[PDB]
Ligand binder design. Structure first.
Ligand SMILES: Cc1nc2ccccc2nc1N1CCCC1
Ligand SMILES: [Mg+2]
Ligand SMILES: [Zn+2]
Length: 313
C-alpha cells in the first residue's frame, strides 16, 4: 500500500491545470489515470492489482476510431479530476470514486457514429435502447467489465454503497447524451437564478453531476488553441465518415457531416461554442466558481475560431 505513482516534474505540475494535454505516449495514460485516482480519492480507494486490470480491460474495449477512443476516455477523466480537485469539500467519497471511473468508461465500445445514424441504419442497439442508445450501451459495457473475475474494483463497498456508486455511474454516463444536456442546463439555470439550487437535494446533485459530465466530455474546446484545433480534425473525421454512411443509406447528411462542405466548419464551430460550450461552462462556473478557467479557455477558443473566419488563420 506504500507504492505511489509519480510523474515527471512537468506532468506533476501541468496535470493539476484544467488545460492539461495527456500527450502522445499511450503507454503513460493508465499511470496518469491511476495517479489522478490516488490524489483525488486515496491510495486505499481501489486494490491496485484490480484497478490496473480494470483499466486495461476498459482500454481494450475502446476502438481505433479517430476521436471516440481511449485517448478521449482519459482526457475526459482528467477534466473531471481537475473539477474534483478545485472543489475539494463539495463531493462525497463515493462520488469521487464513481465519477473518475464513469468518465473513463463513458464512451466504451464507441463505433464513431451518432445515436441518429444507429436509428437510420436500424442498428440492433436502436431496438434495444430507444433513447440515449450508445450511452445505455456504454453503461452496459461498464457493468460487463466490472463483472469479469478479478475486475470488481468496488468489491470492498457495502451492498448499498455499491448500489449507490453504480447509480452515480449510470446517471453520469446517460448525462453524456448531449440531447439531454439542453434541458438539464436550462433547469440548473432556473434553479440557480431563483435561488432554489440545493446541493443536499439528491435530484439537484444529479443535475449538477450531469452538467460536469457535459463539461468534461466537451473539454477539447477548453485546451490551448493548437490542441483544440488539432482535436477538431479527429472530431470532424468521424462526422464526415458518418455523413458518408448517411449518403450510402440514400440520405443527404446535415452539412456538419458532409465532407463536401468543409468550408462551413469555422461557422459550425461558432454556433456550437455559442449554443453548447459557452452556456455549459457559464452555468458550470455559476454553480462551481473554481471551474471558471474552463469558461475562460472556451471563450479564448471562440475568439480563435472568429479569427479563422476573418481569414487571419
Ligand atoms: C460540432 C462539435 N464540435 C465539437 C468540438 C469540440 C468538442 C466536442 C464537439 N462536439 C461537436 N458536436 C457534438 C454533437 C453536435 C456537434
Ligand atoms: Mg458519448
Ligand atoms: Zn465522450
Amino acid at each position: 500500500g506504500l507504492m505511489q505513482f509519480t510523474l515527471p516534474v512537468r506532468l506533476c505540475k501541468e496535470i493539476e491545470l484544467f488545460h492539461f494535454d495527456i500527450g502522445p505516449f499511450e503507454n503513460m495514460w493508465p499511470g496518469i489515470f491511476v495517479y489522478m485516482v490516488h490524489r483525488s480519492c486515496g491510495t486505499s480507494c481501489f486494490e491496485l492489482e484490480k484497478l490496473c486490470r480494470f483499466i486495461m480491460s476498459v482500454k481494450k474495449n475502446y476502438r481505433r476510431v479517430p476521436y471516440h477512443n481511449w485517448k478521449h476516455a482519459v482526457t475526459v477523466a482528467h477534466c473531471m479530476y481537475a473539477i474534483l480537485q478545485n472543489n475539494h469539500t463539495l463531493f462525497t467519497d463515493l462520488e469521487r470514486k464513481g465519477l473518475l471511473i464513469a468518465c473513463l468508461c463513458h464512451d466504451l465500445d464507441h463505433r464513431g457514429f451518432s445515436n441518429s445514424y444507429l436509428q437510420k441504419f436500424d442498428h440492433p442497439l436502436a431496438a434495444l435502447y430507444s433513447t440515449s442508445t450508445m450511452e445505455q450501451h456504454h453503461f452496459s459495457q461498464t457493468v460487463s467489465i466490472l463483472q469479469l473475475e478479478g475486475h470488481n474494483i468496488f468489491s470492498t463497498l457495502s451492498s448499498s454503497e455499491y448500489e449507490q456508486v453504480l447509480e452515480i455511474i449510470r446517471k453520469a454516463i446517460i448525462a453524456t447524451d448531449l440531447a439531454l444536456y439542453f434541458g438539464n442546463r436550462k433547469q440548473l439555470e432556473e434553479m440557480y437564478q431563483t435561488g432554489s439550487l440545493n446541493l443536499n437535494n439528491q435530484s439537484h446533485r444529479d443535475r449538477v453531476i450531469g452538467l460536469m459530465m457535459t463539461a468534461c466530455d466537451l473539454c477539447s474546446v477548453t485546451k490551448l488553441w493548437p490542441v483544440t484545433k488539432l482535436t477538431a480534425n479527429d472530431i470532424y473525421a468521424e462526422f464526415w465518415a458518418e455523413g458518408d454512411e448517411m449518403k450510402k443509406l440514400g440520405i443527404q447528411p446535415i452539412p456538419m457531416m458532409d465532407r463536401d462542405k468543409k468550408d462551413e466548419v469555422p461557422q459550425g464551430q461558432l454556433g456550437f461554442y455559442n449554443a453548447v460550450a459557452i452556456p455549459c461552462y457559464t452555468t458550470l462556473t455559476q454553480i462551481l466558481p473554481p471551474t471558471e478557467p474552463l469558461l475562460k479557455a472556451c471563450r479564448d477558443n471562440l475568439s480563435q475560431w472568429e479569427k479563422v473566419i476573418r481569414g487571419e488563420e
